[PDB]
Each structure stands twice: as C-alpha cells, then as structure tokens.
Symmetry: D2
Subunit: 318 residues, 4 copies
Amino acid sequence: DVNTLTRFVMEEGRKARGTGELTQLLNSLCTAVKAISSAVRKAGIAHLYGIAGSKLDVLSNDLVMNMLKSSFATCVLVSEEDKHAIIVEPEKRGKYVVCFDPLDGSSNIDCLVSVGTIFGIYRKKSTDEPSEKDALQPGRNLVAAGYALYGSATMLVLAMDCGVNCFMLDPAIGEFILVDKDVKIKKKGKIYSLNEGYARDFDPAVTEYIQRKKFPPDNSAPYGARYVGSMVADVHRTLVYGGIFLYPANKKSPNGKLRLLYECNPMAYVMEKAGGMATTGKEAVLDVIPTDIHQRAPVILGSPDDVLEFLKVYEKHS
Amino acid sequence: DVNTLTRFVMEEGRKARGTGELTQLLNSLCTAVKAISSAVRKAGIAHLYGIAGSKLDVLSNDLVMNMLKSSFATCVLVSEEDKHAIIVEPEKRGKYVVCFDPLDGSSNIDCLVSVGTIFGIYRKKSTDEPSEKDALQPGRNLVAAGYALYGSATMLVLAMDCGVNCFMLDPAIGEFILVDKDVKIKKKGKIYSLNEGYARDFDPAVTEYIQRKKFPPDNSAPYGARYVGSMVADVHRTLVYGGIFLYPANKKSPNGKLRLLYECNPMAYVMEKAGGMATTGKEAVLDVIPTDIHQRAPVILGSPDDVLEFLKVYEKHS
Amino acid sequence: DVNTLTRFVMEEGRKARGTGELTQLLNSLCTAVKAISSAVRKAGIAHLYGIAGSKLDVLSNDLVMNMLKSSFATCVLVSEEDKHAIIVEPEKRGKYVVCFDPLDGSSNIDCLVSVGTIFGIYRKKSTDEPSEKDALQPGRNLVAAGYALYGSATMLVLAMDCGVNCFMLDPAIGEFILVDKDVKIKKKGKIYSLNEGYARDFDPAVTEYIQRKKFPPDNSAPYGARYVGSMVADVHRTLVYGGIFLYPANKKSPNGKLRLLYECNPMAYVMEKAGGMATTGKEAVLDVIPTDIHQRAPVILGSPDDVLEFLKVYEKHS
Amino acid sequence: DVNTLTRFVMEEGRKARGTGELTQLLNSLCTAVKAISSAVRKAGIAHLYGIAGSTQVKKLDVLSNDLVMNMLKSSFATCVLVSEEDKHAIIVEPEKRGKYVVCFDPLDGSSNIDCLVSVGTIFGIYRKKSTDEPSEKDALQPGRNLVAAGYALYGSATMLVLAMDCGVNCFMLDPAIGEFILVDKDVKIKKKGKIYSLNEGYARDFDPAVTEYIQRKKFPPDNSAPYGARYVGSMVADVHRTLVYGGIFLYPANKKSPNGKLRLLYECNPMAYVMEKAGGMATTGKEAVLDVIPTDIHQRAPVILGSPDDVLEFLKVYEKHS
Ligand SMILES: COc1ccc(S(=O)(=O)NC(=O)c2cc3c(-c4cccc(NC(C)=O)c4)ccc([N+](=O)[O-])c3[nH]2)cc1
Ligand SMILES: COc1ccc(S(=O)(=O)NC(=O)c2cc3c(-c4cccc(NC(C)=O)c4)ccc([N+](=O)[O-])c3[nH]2)cc1
Ligand SMILES: COc1ccc(S(=O)(=O)NC(=O)c2cc3c(-c4cccc(NC(C)=O)c4)ccc([N+](=O)[O-])c3[nH]2)cc1
Ligand SMILES: COc1ccc(S(=O)(=O)NC(=O)c2cc3c(-c4cccc(NC(C)=O)c4)ccc([N+](=O)[O-])c3[nH]2)cc1
Ligand SMILES: O=P(O)(O)OC[C@H]1O[C@](O)(COP(=O)(O)O)[C@@H](O)[C@@H]1O
Ligand SMILES: O=P(O)(O)OC[C@H]1O[C@](O)(COP(=O)(O)O)[C@@H](O)[C@@H]1O
Ligand SMILES: O=P(O)(O)OC[C@H]1O[C@](O)(COP(=O)(O)O)[C@@H](O)[C@@H]1O
Ligand SMILES: O=P(O)(O)OC[C@H]1O[C@](O)(COP(=O)(O)O)[C@@H](O)[C@@H]1O
C-alpha cells in the first residue's frame, strides 16, 4: 500500500490529536524541497543562456523561508544564510522554531557534487515575544529533523519519535514516496569518512583512530574511505551503509567547522533515532547547550560500535 | 548566442564534410543519456510502489545498447554490463566502435551517490568482419570520448580534437545547453582524491606522494581531500576544480581496479584534451595497447603539474 | 502569499474540526490526477516505441481506484469504466462515496483533444454495509465535487460549501497552486456550446434558443459558438468566460448522453457554487433522484442569465 | 526502430546531400516548441505566485514569439522571418543569414488560453527566390512554393506535425526526455469524414453557400447520418482533429468579414500544405489556398479544408450559388 510523506505525517498527527501545525510545516518544507530540486537540477537553465533573447544558495533560502512563513506554523527561523534569526511577522506566527541549512555543500556545487537541505524543528518553549533565544535549545528538544538529499535522485529523510523514514521524490508527479520504513543503521560499519587533507593538524586521537582503520591490528580488513565533501551526501551514505563520519575538532579549530544548530544536531538526531550515535568527543551532540545560533560543534557520528571505538581512542588522549 | 550539443556536433561535422555518422551516434547517445537521467532521478518510481495497484544497471545498458545500434553509426559495442562485445547486426552496421560504462558508480546507487555514463568512440581500424578485436585499440586512437554525470544536475562532457566542451541538461525542455567552451584544467590543483582505505597496500611512490600532500615539505598549504567513490564524480571535479585523482593498484586489484577501455581511456582522453595528464605510472594511459576488453589499469590523472610531481616521485622509486 | 490545494484543504478541515478523511481523500485524488496528467502528456512514451529495445482509459481509472481505496476515506466507488459500484474492502473503508469519470472525453483523445477527471463526493450515513445504493443520492447531497482538466495546462477545480477554487498544476514541482479564489461565473456570457449536428432531433425549445443566439431578438450581438466536444473543456471555458453549455435530448439519447452521477452532478455543483445554474429542463440537475448509477440526464448549465433565458424558452413549450 | 524528428530530418538531408540549413532550422524550431510547451503547461508557475517571495512574466503569446524568433535567428538558416506578432517582416542580421524564409504564428488560439483551450504554433518554410538584399517581398510567395510546413499542438499531449514533399509525419513530444518521437508515418486523411467544424455563431452573416452546405450536414437529403459538429475555436486543434479523424474545417468569407479571418501566410498556407501532402484539400472557394499570390504579409483568406470528398461537396454548393 503506497505511502507519501503527507499521508505518513497526517496519520501520525491525527493519532497524536495535534493542532495540524507540524503537518502544515512539513508540507511547506516538502514543497520548498521540490522547488529546490527543480532548480538544482537546472530546469530552465536554457533561458539564462539566451534561448528566448535575454544564487542557488539564495534561491533555496528564499524558498524555505517563504514556504515556512506561509505555513502559519513557525515563529523563529534560523538559516545558515542569515546573520540573525528571522522573526516571523505576527499574523503568520505558529508554534515551531526551525533551524535549517538550505543548500548544504553548495561550496563545491560547481562540480555538481551532491547537495542537500538540512532541517531541525523545535517547539518554542517560552511565551516571550519570539527572539533568537528560542533557537538556543539542545538537540534533545528536537521534535522533528532530517534532510533532503539532491543526489542521483532527491530523497527526504525524516526523523521523528516514531523513527526514521525515507521518502523518494518522484519528479513525474511531485510526490515523496515512502521507500524505507523505520530505518536502522548497522551496528558496525566498514567505511570511514573525513577530510584527511587536514591530517597535519589532526588531533592525535583522530590520527590514531584513522590509522587503526587503515592498518588494523586484528586480522580484519581495513575500512574503505569515502568523503564526498558534502555533509548530506556523506551522512546519508553512513546511514545506508553504516560506518563513521567525522568533522572533528583540532587545535586550529577547537569546535570543528560544522554548525550545531542546522547541521550537526539534525544529523545527530537522525543517527540516534536510527540507533546510531553522534558525539563531539566530549559529549553527545544533542546534549550541547547552544549560546550562539551559528556556533560550531565537532561531530563524530554513524554506527554505534564505530563511534564507541572512536571515543575509546579519544579518551586515551584526554 | 545559445548553443546545444546537437548544434555543436553538426557544425563541427559540416565543417569536416563528413558522412554524418558520428553525429547520428552522439545524438543517439544524447537520447539515451536523457532517458537514463530521468530513470536515475526516479522518473516514475511511484508506479513501482503500487500507485495504480500494480535494474537501473540493466536499463541504462539497454538504452545505450539500443540507441547506438539504432544510430546506424556503430558496428561493435563494448559495455561493462556485457561479458563479450556486442556485434551490431549487418543491416545496421556503421563505422564506429563504442566502449562504454552505462551507469558507472552504480554499485553504491543505494546511498544516492553521483553516477555517470562513460563512453569512448573509435573508428573501426581493421577491415575484418567486426569482432571484439576492433575494440582493442589504444586510447590514442579515440575519435571522441566523454561522460554524462548524473549529479546535482545532469551534465554531458564531450571531448574531441576541438577540445572539451560541457553541456548542461535542461530537463525542463530536454536539451543539452553549452555552458563551458573549450575547457582547460588548472595547471596545478589543491585537491587529491583516492581511496586511502588501501593505504596498507600502496607502493612506496603513492605513499610518498600522498605524504607530500598532507605534509608539504615546502611551506605550503596541504591539499584538501575528496573521494566520492564514483569515478565520473571524482574525475569531473578534478576537471572543474583541478588537482589529482588516483586509483593505484593494491593487493586485490594487482592491475588496478578501473577499466582501461571504458573508464580510464575516456577519462584520460578528456583530460589530455583539457591540458591534463593521465598515467599508469609506467606509461600514459592512452598508449596502453589492450588485449582484453575488460582488463583493468592503474590510473593517475589530473592537473599536469600534479601528475608530473607524482611521476618524479615514481622515478625516485623506480 | 502562495497557497496549495493540500494546504487549503486541511486548513478548511482544521476549522471544521473534522476527522481527516476528506483531506486524505482529496490528497489521494490529487496524486492520481498528477499521475494521470503525466501519462496524458505522454511522458515515457518513447519506451513504448523502442527507446530501450524491449489504455489511458484503464490506466486513469486504475489510478483513481487505487488512490481512493488507499486513502481509507471511501467505501463506495462508482466509475464510468465499471459496470457496478466498487465496494471498498472492510479494512480500508471510510465514510465517503465517490463517483468519478477518470478520463472524460478520451474517446477522441487520438486527436489530442482536451480531457479531464470529474469527481463528486457524497457522505454515507447509513450504518448498513456499504452498497451501490449508497451512490443513489441527489446532487444536493454533495460534500465536494470538481474536476481536473488536462488542457494546455493541468488545472484542478474544487467546489465545496466555501465556494469554487482553482489550482494550477505546476509540473516542475508537482504542486497544485491556488491561482483563482472563490470564483464566480459571469452573470451573462457570449458563448453557446453544444453539438449542433443533432439539430434534426432537438426539441423545439432547444431549437428556438439556438436561434435566439444566432439572430438575437433584442438586437444584441450574436453569441459565438465553441464546442470542444469534451465536457470538462467545455464546462471550464463556461466557468472562466461565461455563457452556456448544453447536451439536451436527441434520438440516440432520449434522456441525454452525459451521466448524471459523475458527469452532470459534479459540473452542476461547481456551477451553482460559482453562482451559475444547471437544469435538465424540468428540474435542477442536483434535484434529480437517480435510480441507476449509470443513468443519463439532459444538462444545460452556465451563467444564470443564459440558463434562465433557455428556461424561459423551455417553459414557453411546456 | 525508434525515430526522432531530428533523426528523420537528418537522414532526409543526407539522401539529398544538402547544406544542413533546413535541419538546423527544424532543430531550432524543435527547441522553441519544447520551451513553449513547458511554458504553456505552466512549468514554473508557482514562482509567479510567490513560493520564493519577490524574485518570464511575459504573456506566453509574447514568450513564444521571442522563443521562435530567437531560435530561428540562431539557426543561421533564415534571412526573412514573418510573425503574426510583428507588423513588418524581420530581416535577419547579416552575420546570421541563411537561405530560408519562415512565416509562423507563435501561439495561435492564445486569445482564449485563459480557459486552457488547446493552442499551437504554426509554421511554413520557403526558400528565397530573389537575388536582392533580403526584404519583406521574399515572404510574398504562394503556398505552392512551400518547402516544409506544419505545426505544434499543445493539446493533452504536445505533437509536432511536419509536412514535406515526402509527406506528413507526426512526432509526439516525450516531456520526460525532451524528444519528438515519430509515432505516425506518412499520414493520410480519410477520403470522407463525419465531422464539420466552423463558428456557427456567425450564421446571420454566412454566405448562402455555407448556409446550404451546413444545412446538408445537419439535414442530409439521402438518408445518411447527420455529421457531428466540433469547433474548439483553436485552428491548430481543429485542423489536427480534421487530419486525424477526417471531415471539414471552415473559416469562410462573411458578409462582415469579406476575406475570412485567418491569416494566409502563417495560418492558412501551412494548414493547406499539410492537408495537400496528407491527401486532402484546402480551398478559398474560388481557388486553391496555396495558389493565392499574396500582396500583404498579413492579408487574410477564406479557408475550407479537410477530407477531399467533403471539400468537393462544398465546392459544388459554392459553384451552384455563383
Ligand atoms: C507524531 O507526529 C505528528 C505529526 C503531526 C502532528 S500535528 O500537530 O501537525 N496534528 C496533525 O497533523 C493532525 C491532527 C488531525 C486530526 C485530529 C484528530 C483528533 C484530535 C485532534 N486534535 C485536537 C482535538 O486538538 C486532531 C484529524 C485529522 C487530521 N488530518 O488527517 O489532517 C489531523 N492532522 C502531531 C504529531
Ligand atoms: C569534428 O566533428 C565532427 C562531427 C561529426 C562528423 S560526421 O562524420 O557525423 N559528418 C557530419 O556531422 C555532417 C556533415 C554535414 C554536411 C556536409 C557538407 C559537405 C560535405 C559533406 N560530406 C560529403 C560530400 O561526403 C557533408 C552538411 C550538413 C550537415 N548537417 O548539419 O547535418 C552535416 N553533418 C565529422 C566531424
Ligand atoms: C470544509 O472542508 C473540509 C475539509 C476537510 C475536512 S476533514 O473531516 O477531512 N478534517 C480535516 O481534514 C482536518 C481536521 C484537522 C484537525 C482537527 C482539529 C480539531 C478537531 C478535529 N476533529 C475531532 C476532535 O474530531 C480535527 C487538526 C489539524 C488538521 N490538519 O491541519 O491536518 C486537521 N485536518 C472537513 C471539511
Ligand atoms: C528533404 O528534406 C531535407 C532535409 C534537410 C536538408 S539539408 O539542406 O538541411 N541537409 C542536411 O540536413 C544534411 C546533409 C548531410 C550530409 C551531406 C552528405 C553529402 C553531401 C552533402 N552536401 C554537399 C557536398 O554539399 C551533405 C551528411 C551528413 C548529414 N548529417 O546526418 O548531419 C547531413 N545533413 C535538405 C532536405
Ligand atoms: O572542505 P571541508 O573542510 O572538508 O568541509 C566539508 C564540509 O563543509 C560543508 O560543505 C559545509 O559548507 P557549505 O557552506 O558549502 O554548506 C559540509 O557539507 C561538509 O561536510
Ligand atoms: O570502492 P573503491 O575501491 O573505492 O572503488 C570505487 C570505484 O569503483 C567504481 O564504482 C566502479 O564502478 P561500479 O560502481 O560500476 O562498479 C568507480 O566509479 C570508482 O572509482
Ligand atoms: O460527441 P458528442 O455526441 O457531441 O458528445 C460529446 C460528449 O461525450 C463525452 O466525450 C463523453 O464521452 P467519452 O468520455 O466516452 O469520450 C463528453 O465529454 C462530451 O461532452
Ligand atoms: O472566435 P472565432 O471568430 O470563431 O475565431 C477563432 C479563430 O481565431 C483564431 O483564434 C486566431 O487566433 P488568435 O487567438 O491568435 O487570435 C484561430 O485559432 C481560430 O480558428
């Protein structure tokens, strides 16, 4: 029996006897994602090249912002693309706070690398007039989170309390189809993913863990290496195949590079609902209390056996 | 003044007062590429999931296999998917021999990684009846070669004598728009790309070259690392951004993993026409005389300064 | 401030404090309509004609049937294609009865004429086992009705107690965009639409009315004539421009050609919700109490002044 | 064996050892038709209604004119272009000139496109017969001189119908891959149909031959079945139905439209040419449409076309009343 993201979230919502706002929100997100995919896939590029006579970052941000605002389900919107939190105008305010990265990985989108949209959804916890402060919530408080991946196909991965579900965008009918239900990550994987160009500034624990993957001391096959350079692609692979992903801290970068509110946390939430783990090396990513909406956080995520092994090496150096 | 693949190839052919076969071939290949892109982007997957009540490898092969047969421009077809060369039926025989990987990278299609269609086109040399022998020419003898990348967008990259030109698929109108003319690769890059999971197996030249990239003995910034794990993706980025790509040999894969006929030679050709290089370490990829349509080869290709640097390391250890 | 059919419908549902089934029903129908639109525009047709080597009646009807069964919102499904009402199996049953024409007008689709999907939705309030007799209801009992027209573009027209709203299918993102709110028909129009090839068989009141259009007796401008031959096209033009559409009785169809349950009633309901009218000559279309799910009715609909003019002529003869 | 428009027109050019200009022209047009089709089907309409806030917006009939004009210019194959939209024939800039003269209606029927009526693009292609600088006069040729002609139909599906001396061929647009698939080869029209098409609102102003012929279609004198009526109001749709089911389509001369309404150069001629190559007929009542020597690029003409027996039957009535 065929299932869409809309049918799926409606049935979850009416079982919880909710007000409808979260379903309104995810439909808006879904619509924005579909438009982003059309633009990423370069539909109508011919017109820009003069076919009739006479920004992807920004257009993606513009779609997520406007679609989310017009949902009447949000009050505060934090985007990688905006210096300050966007306060929804009063007559459109709903009860959710969304943090998102509209087109993650676009830094190298000139080579047609996979990119994605990342989102995490919170309840406003206070009745104060809405402010930046409403996004300064730990990942533990997440209500929903996930990502759209613009890869060889476009897929939305959606994480809630009910688990992780994968919807494939059928572009012929603009409908997100349920194709993988209540997904769970391998307890131990065989791929490791991190940018080894930074090896000279590696934290010595990172160096030892990576060297244990390439030169294991126990009969075992060395892990394979993958590193797309686009987080949504690398994390999604980690979830499908298992294994470990790392953007760790070092001495030039005490807090890693990736941003906690709209990269690290949603991915950490997907991982943990998938039975995986996500650490900074000092604590669970979902346990960090943010003080700045654009703050960075180290992230080591993926299969639990692998993340656990990394923390074993990490502690050995602390 | 807008240009398309069909227009570009017709004009080069009209200028060469040709027979029109290569243009029938490249236009048929374009049709097959667009059907692949639609299918890879999940065209109508909702029918497969029961929307009306009621293999990506195989279909892509069938689309290229049939469209080329149907061009009347080919007589021998070699595909990764087929054990032996396809001999076109006499009624449809043309003068060209085509070696292709129909959906390269698809072993990891489950995580929606970038995939691609790699192709290389030869003129039949022998006057014998057509056979597998006709595909055993050195890459030097290539008339045309290139790839279609199914990434964030679908792009066709075609290399001929005139150079390497890049065409974006506008899926809104199904047309390959010329977006980069007469492309040339950077003289020296800032990215290296190889599966370092086989580090335990690297010969000393690769180990030293890779050490040079993470710990440059000269002041400089270390290279960044990218390994998508799909050759079309990794090579295109190399082309677009510069740098070096490597699949050296290892314990499994003593002759290297990638395929000479329909993976290495097309990419080496694209690269050489772009000002780049492509070596096996011992010789240029295009000088290897094949003996078996599916034989493997080591490959180091990319920006010329980076490949020359690798070869100086190779010599030091030779 | 953009708005979608999905967003519009659940916002009407939230306000009504309803059970959700109507939204699940209409969202499922929307999916069917998007799949039909794609097939109607012949996407994937090249696969039929050999692109890779190796019925719109039936296919559209399968799409509506399964999408409606899948919604859990219907219990009795009457369609043009099926001799009997389809009873939904117990575990998928909802409270709604849907009568539809899955691909109205398709008899002449070999000529690429406009076609569409007509639907009408009644509630069942028996507590008896659902049965075909639950579809024998006057149009007055319609909960919702409308149509999807596959014209130069695809539009869904949806009518409820809150009025008529018009949604454009954006094929780039597979979304139904609200483009015309709370629409109302022109008080009087300038187009009359019917098959004049039945002139030898018209009742004299039909004959007199047509003559008034061609030789206006108040010395106004003659009406223009338009007959696409496809009910959805002809009715939609009537809704947008005003005027009158007629399929009266003739020798081959002594009580009309078009079907009361899933052709006349939905169109009649849409007309009355846009401030137009729909009569059989003797009574309001919506007032007919049917005794057979496939029974036919004469229909005259359009702008109220035009229908009243026909009725003044009809009454002069009865 | 699968055949696209590009492949079918290419192999025709190889057979005749041509310069490639006509193929570059039709490929140009095919690109324009595909862009028009995507816009007609409201491709990115949601941006117009603000899914991304405030950031073409032309009116489709204007977009289509730009699309056809630009593509044809860029084909390097045309010297004089005539459009319904521009009062004067466009002279292609010299750098871009080729041998063909093209007359087209970029989005015919678009007046009612707000009701999502079927619409279409019409074209006819001539060679330049003059030796002078290209001028408007170069498009004042009789339909007889047409090299190729046809139309795109933006109906429930998009289809390009292409007529040349080799006959009439129908190519269905596959929007999934942007390819025109040859689906009906060497089409021919039924010798006699069962549908008549014309705007009967103008009955009061009809010529008496039209009145009689139409009354014959409704009240036949020989116990034949009366014809059915269809009239989309959109020439491309009506003429295509005529090509596929047979029958007759009429926009005839009026008391108040002494020269009909449809434009000779880029509406009647291409439809007349498509009919003639498909085994049918196309008359003004007083001559074959294609024989009319035009003196104005925007002059109009009566046009009766369709099944040969039906047009003939009509002319008998026309000769009786003359
Ligand atoms: C765990 O996953 C979640 C996803 C979404 C949401 S929610 O906040 O967005 N709620 C909805 O979506 C939603 C609720 C609802 C109801 C419904 C039924 C009984 C009680 C109430 N509620 C009161 C009396 O207060 C409502 C009926 C029909 C539809 N329907 O089919 O549209 C509904 N949809 C929450 C959780
Ligand atoms: C470097 O790039 C290439 C790509 C393709 C090819 S080729 O082998 O496929 N030939 C073609 O493409 C091609 C040729 C050609 C001609 C043409 C003109 C004068 C002489 C001849 N020939 C004889 C007298 O024998 C032909 C006219 C119109 C078109 N046209 O616009 O369709 C043409 N297309 C070669 C090289
Ligand atoms: C006139 O137009 C219509 C269109 C649709 C419908 S309905 O019957 O299918 N209802 C729905 O769709 C729908 C209801 C609903 C609720 C909701 C809220 C308070 C009470 C209840 N109900 C109980 C306690 O019993 C439900 C909350 C959120 C969403 N939401 O935004 O998903 C909802 N959607 C009716 C009429
Ligand atoms: C009946 O319908 C028509 C449709 C199209 C045309 S044409 O004028 O546009 N010619 C073409 O299209 C076209 C020609 C051509 C040739 C070719 C071959 C031998 C000689 C010459 N010519 C010289 C020596 O002068 C050319 C080779 C390859 C391709 N090819 O497959 O690319 C070609 N395409 C005319 C009529
Ligand atoms: O180049 P690096 O330092 O390896 O970083 C790659 C990381 O940066 C990101 O591209 C974030 O950068 P963007 O601003 O382009 O979104 C992540 O997707 C990815 O994980
Ligand atoms: O898994 P590895 O050892 O890194 O090898 C990856 C290589 O294998 C390939 O995927 C071969 O392609 P396939 O997926 O078609 O087998 C190349 O694209 C890629 O460069
Ligand atoms: O050809 P006629 O007798 O004028 O009737 C046309 C009517 O028939 C219909 O096409 C219904 O028939 P089909 O659905 O079988 O094609 C209506 O859409 C249209 O109004
Ligand atoms: O409404 P009328 O007078 O019957 O004329 C309709 C005719 O006019 C046209 O619409 C002319 O097209 P335009 O919409 O571009 O004016 C033809 O397509 C059609 O045959």
